[PDB]
Amino acid sequence: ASRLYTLVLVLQPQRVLLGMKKRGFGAGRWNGFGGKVQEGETIEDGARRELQEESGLTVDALHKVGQIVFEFVGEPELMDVHVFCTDSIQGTPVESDEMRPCWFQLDQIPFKDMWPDDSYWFPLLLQKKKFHGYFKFQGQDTILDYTLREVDTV
Numbered sequence: 001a002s003r004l005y006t007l008v009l010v011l012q013p014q015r016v017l018l019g020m021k022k023r024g025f026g027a028g029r030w031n032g033f034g035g036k037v038q039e040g041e042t043i044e045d046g047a048r049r050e051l052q053e054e055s056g057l058t059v060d061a062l063h064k065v066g067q068i069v070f071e072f073v074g075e076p077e078l079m080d081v082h083v084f085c086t087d088s089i090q091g092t093p094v095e096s097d098e099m100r101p102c103w104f105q106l107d108q109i110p111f112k113d114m115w116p117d118d119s120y121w122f123p124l125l126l127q128k129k130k131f132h133g134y135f136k137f138q139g140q141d142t143i144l145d146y147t148l149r150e151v152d153t154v
């Protein structure tokens with residue numbers, strides 16, 4: 001029982017674009033751009049669509065860098081998150097109803113205002129490693145269990 005999600009990190013050589021989530025689950029934290037994959041679109045299509053809906057940006061290409069499965073205690077569906085990177089943005093990011101985009105220098109990532117699991121996997125993404133992750137949460141603050149490794153194929 002899982003549901004496909006996307007997450008896109010716009011990672012340029014000395015900075016990364018994150019969006020302050022303004023509403024829904026995880027509001028108040030800086031996230032990458034993404035959401036649920038819809039009937040009738042590929043995972044990469046859905047990643048592109050959400051990046052455009054949430055920041056205005058389009059891209060030349062996305063690169064698959066990770067997969068993360070989230071379990072929330074008491075929730076029947078696992079989140080199957082397909083994580084992509086890009087450094088070919090077209091446009092200037094703009095605020096949407098859902099996200100307030102801001103650039104962060106790579107030594108000033110706002111980890112204390114991010115999901116706690118980010119402290120584990122986001123560095124792998126920054127190191128250009130591909131990864132598979134699993135995090136079991138109780139609520140939004142507590143990681144009960146996790147697994148994390150690098151992989152050759154996502």
Ligand SMILES: CCNC(=O)c1cc2c(N3CCOC[C@@H]3C)ccnc2[nH]1
Nearest residue numbers: 007025026030031032081115117118122
């Ligand atoms: C480095 C940027 N990191 C994230 O953007 C990020 C999002 C996220 C998360 N949620 C759950 C609710 O739907 C949105 C998202 C898939 C749960 C746990 N860790 C997360 N990290």
